[PDB]
Ligand binder design. Sequence first.
Ligand SMILES: [Mn+2]
Ligand SMILES: [Mn+2]
Ligand SMILES: [Mn+2]
Ligand SMILES: [Mn+2]
Ligand SMILES: [Mn+2]
Ligand SMILES: [Mn+2]
Ligand SMILES: [Mn+2]
Ligand SMILES: [Mn+2]
Ligand SMILES: [Mn+2]
Ligand SMILES: [Mn+2]
Ligand SMILES: [Mn+2]
Ligand SMILES: [Mn+2]
Ligand SMILES: [Mn+2]
Ligand SMILES: [Mn+2]
Lengths: 258, 258, 258, 258
Amino acid sequence: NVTIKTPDDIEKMRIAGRLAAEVLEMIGEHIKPGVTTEELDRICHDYIVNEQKAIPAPLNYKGFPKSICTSINHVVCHGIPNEKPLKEGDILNVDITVIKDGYHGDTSKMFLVGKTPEWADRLCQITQECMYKGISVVRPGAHLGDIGEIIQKHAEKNGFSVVREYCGHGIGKVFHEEPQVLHYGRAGTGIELKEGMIFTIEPMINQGRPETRLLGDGWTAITKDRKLSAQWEHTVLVTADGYEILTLRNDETFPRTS
Amino acid sequence: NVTIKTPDDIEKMRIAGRLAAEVLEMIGEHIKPGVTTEELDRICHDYIVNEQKAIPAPLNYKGFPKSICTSINHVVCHGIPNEKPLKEGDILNVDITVIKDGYHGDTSKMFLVGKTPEWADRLCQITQECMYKGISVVRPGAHLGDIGEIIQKHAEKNGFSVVREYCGHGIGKVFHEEPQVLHYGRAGTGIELKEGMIFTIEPMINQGRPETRLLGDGWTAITKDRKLSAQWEHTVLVTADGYEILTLRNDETFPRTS
Amino acid sequence: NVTIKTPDDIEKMRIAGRLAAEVLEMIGEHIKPGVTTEELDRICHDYIVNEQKAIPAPLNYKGFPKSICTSINHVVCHGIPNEKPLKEGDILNVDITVIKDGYHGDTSKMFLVGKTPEWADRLCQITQECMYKGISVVRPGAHLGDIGEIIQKHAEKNGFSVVREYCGHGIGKVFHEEPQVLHYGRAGTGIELKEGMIFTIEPMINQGRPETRLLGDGWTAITKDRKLSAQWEHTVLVTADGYEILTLRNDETFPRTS
Amino acid sequence: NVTIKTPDDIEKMRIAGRLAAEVLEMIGEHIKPGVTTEELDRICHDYIVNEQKAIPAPLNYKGFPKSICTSINHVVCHGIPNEKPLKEGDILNVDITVIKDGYHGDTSKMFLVGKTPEWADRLCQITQECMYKGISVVRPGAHLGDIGEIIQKHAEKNGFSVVREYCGHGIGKVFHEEPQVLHYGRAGTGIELKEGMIFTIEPMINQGRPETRLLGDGWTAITKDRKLSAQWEHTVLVTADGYEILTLRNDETFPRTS
Ligand SMILES: [Mn+2]
Ligand SMILES: [Mn+2]
Ligand SMILES: [Mn+2]
Ligand SMILES: [Mn+2]
Ligand SMILES: [Mn+2]
Ligand SMILES: [Mn+2]
Ligand SMILES: [Mn+2]
Ligand SMILES: [Mn+2]
Ligand SMILES: [Mn+2]
Ligand SMILES: [Mn+2]
Ligand SMILES: [Mn+2]
Ligand SMILES: [Mn+2]
Ligand SMILES: [Mn+2]
Ligand SMILES: [Mn+2]
């Protein structure tokens, strides 16, 4: 079973989505060479807890030890904030999930630290475009495989591959619910969407091969071939006749709704 | 098979669309109780031929006897201008198509004649929204049934029904061409939209039931239940990033392109 | 693969279906206690061949020796018209298929012969209802298992069983093509329905248990428990919108389309 | 406008009328269950051509492919003789027109094939009575309407209906001339009868509703409700005193003249 949110649920999911988005709008100005990922963690934690009157969902979730994930360069996802400083040339994913009165909002973005290689800007830009294209096919009657196909085409046309062993997910009063949202596949397949469903689209897109590999800490996934990997995430509501992005930021120019 | 207009074709279509739009903006000022529909036909005729240096496409088209269509209240489409005066409380569709140097521009709008009942107003408002929604899903890679579903869902959800046996149409150097644009249907179905296609979105939406009957004159369609019917129409080009409304008027707030 | 009928095909399937419906409307007036099924076969054959200028598809089809099927009481399907007279109390299915210019129309109905017992009437009523419900979910993007599921649940919730080893079928210029249309199963399974597909929905529903067995003659299927079995069949087109019952009789009050 | 026949025309119309009568007197012997309408056709053709030295007027007349019309049961008129055997219980109309030296005689009667139901014998009788009453109001100064009214009043008192789409006709050296003789209407309407006019009275009376439909062959008209229809016809001269029935048979008791 996949849950269908009620209009009061939906109203609380917007509040949580907007706060998650705000963490990312806030954090931007602290992102520069020499800031450590655990300093970023601490800043986002304090903001969420003290200013938004909310809770960071990753903290202690299945043992995860921090409030945010910070994934740099060849790391695909789930990087643990630590004492390493950011370096000129790094690309950085900051993945935020906020819980507000029980409702979750989940989003992430890429940051380019200083002078980055040019393959890297474009990897980040195309990955963001993939997410947006997945979002744009969302409507009642669409199938989950439409999201995957349109993401996969756009990645592969640009010489990149789609990560297969991590995916998006339903979200609500629970952080991870059904369905699993694959970022590759075949249009018209998988389950059919319905108004009131909420789920994330969070493609991870690699510069080389798609395979990944888990590090010692059991969290941090990296690209097997050690090339770069980028991710962007939004929380998406299926509306009556399209989509609403619950986690849209004010820097973004993509439409909040269809 | 569906033509693909060239850059020069498109510019000529842009000119024809603007001209068709200007007929509607011009005629608005002559619409009031007491004026006859044949008088409005005359005024549109002379504006088209003598001022625009264009041709009224409907005139003698498969025997049609006038230069415009004028549909009042329960008449669904293709009403024939005549000696009957417009009455306080009527709703009037004026449907225009202009040929300029061989290129067609097709558009219609509703006019409220003097003081109108609120159920009439609501009909005209929902039909316009249906049309705008239909236009908003237009981009390369959309399908035709996306237009049909969004229109039908919006109408039916608000208590109205969609006319089934009349539809929009490809348009260019010919008045009526492939494809048929159904105002009902299921998204993802039908042909796939490509840049440079041009067709009309022209939903006819009824107050009660969808059924129509053709009167003796072989032209004038009415609602079978004799309840009200409204229509709005625009000529639409698929662009690289979405849509351009070639028949947009000055009095509209809905945007020209994506 | 499943054939998609062109619009011309469809117009010809509409003709064939009206003709098949008309046989059923005609033959109703000859059904009463005392008349043999042979005589009804003869009357149906004559009407089809001499008045409709059409052909009865069952005649000689895989050896079948008559023009219509006549299935009485515990007979589930494919009964052979014979010299036995109908008796008061009987329920009778007449299953017609007409070929008009190569195109097929397939439909059946239950007749109550004279005074029938109440449980026989209830069986016939629930079978018709099941057929209508099966038809009601037909539209583009539906799945074949949706038809099955809704028939099965209505039958079973009302105390009856669904016959499993006979099913509906694609039909057009051939009598029996893909897909197989099972009258039991699960929503969302099976092939997706598309505009232009045509197939029968013809559930056989039993008073008691679902199992059948085939008599010596190679054709006549009966209930294993010798209780009553009913069937109703229509030919159904998938339209842009939903469904169109090509075999609708003017005695029916269920809507021709959705 | 209508022609007046000369005394000499008249004497040649008597000859043709008598010969048409004699075809009907001859053919009764051969009417029994199992004989085909085409054999009756063939027998009539040969008698007319070889024994009467005349011509069967229906042959190749506007494409009609036989020498006589044979209408059975729910066939209203213009049945084409074919391979189908007459069946006991059938009512048959045999309609004859003989051309003798350029002059036409046109008449038909009902036959009962073997044992026949009571309702049917009665339709045939009442229809005969309607014709005779129709004949009985014929004199100079009578109006055509008189003929229609009195046939219609008798039909309707008996629960039967008059066919409106076919009618009697002037007849002479041409098969069909002015006027149209309607078998329904209001007394004192229509043109005024004058001595020397010759026309047919040929009422088709249906057991149920009046409406007809045409079978695919473009000739064979049946009752739309499929109920019985009967017809009888004579060719009638207007005289000094009243009427003369040119096609009276020797088995008939009604007076030849007024
Ligand atoms: Mn996340
Ligand atoms: Mn997530
Ligand atoms: Mn990375
Ligand atoms: Mn109207
Ligand atoms: Mn128009
Ligand atoms: Mn496509
Ligand atoms: Mn148009
Ligand atoms: Mn069948
Ligand atoms: Mn599906
Ligand atoms: Mn069948
Ligand atoms: Mn049975
Ligand atoms: Mn008859
Ligand atoms: Mn005749
Ligand atoms: Mn005649």
